[PDB]
Design brief:
The structure is a homodimer.
Chain A: E1 2-7, E2 13-18, E3 21-26, E4 31-36, E5 41-47, E6 51-59, E7 62-69, E8 71-79, E9 82-90, E10 95-101, E11 109-117, E12 120-126, E13 129-137
Parallel strand pairs in A: 3-5, 4-6, 5-7, 6-8, 7-9, 8-10, 9-13, 10-12, 11-13
Antiparallel strand pairs in A: 1-4, 2-3
Region (Disordered) (chain B): 27-137
Disulfide bonds (chain B): 4-21
Biased composition (Polar residues) (chain B): 122-137
Amino acid sequence: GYSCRAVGVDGRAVTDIQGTCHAKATGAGAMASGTSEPGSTSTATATGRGATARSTSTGRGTATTTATGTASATSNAIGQGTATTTATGSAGGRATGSATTSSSASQPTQTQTITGPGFQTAKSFARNTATTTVTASHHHHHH
Amino acid sequence: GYSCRAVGVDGRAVTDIQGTCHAKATGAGAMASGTSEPGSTSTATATGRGATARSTSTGRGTATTTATGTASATSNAIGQGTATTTATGSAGGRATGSATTSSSASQPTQTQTITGPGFQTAKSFARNTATTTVTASH
């Protein structure tokens, strides 16, 4: 197997490519990492303070994570499938997402898209294509 | 085939589900649309004034688009593959992205991510997995 990681630094990108594992981080407080195997692909990209991207894959899975701002994205493509998580947190909004694929999952395809203020979370699970997109902006209004 | 479209209004989300085509738009000035086939999946979500999401899929492709704010996201999963685009634009900025899959591409996977102020654009193209994320601030 392969593993890769990048610690973000202000004013540049940092990239680490090891085999089929690609990690890239931009900005202090960002962290990107992954693990993969020769037949699989993991790509993790983190940008900005509070961004964490984590991609794990095995077999013939493809795991992709993109975290921008105050956001966490975790994708696990375990044996097969395409697990893609995009989490974006802006102006105080915190976004957390995950996507997992496995031959054992309930549905062949599952797509979850969650957009709103303040803290937002989303998850997906599928055999073949699990896509999670979570976008958080500003704070939840107070009532 | 199937086609779907949701044109946003103020005060409620608009959803249009037609077969394997799912469109959702929230807010006046938002629009989501797509086209798909029985073996494919298209999902398009747009939120806020100036957000446009368009997902086209055929064969066994999966096309997903999410546009938030001043943003355009377009995904084309033609015949095969997973094409995912997320575009987020603050007022004063604009984010434009596309992701395309096709057996005609040279690489099996491609990921593109761009973040910055003002006008930002990114595009990806691959055989199996194309992912694009564009975040524009002001």
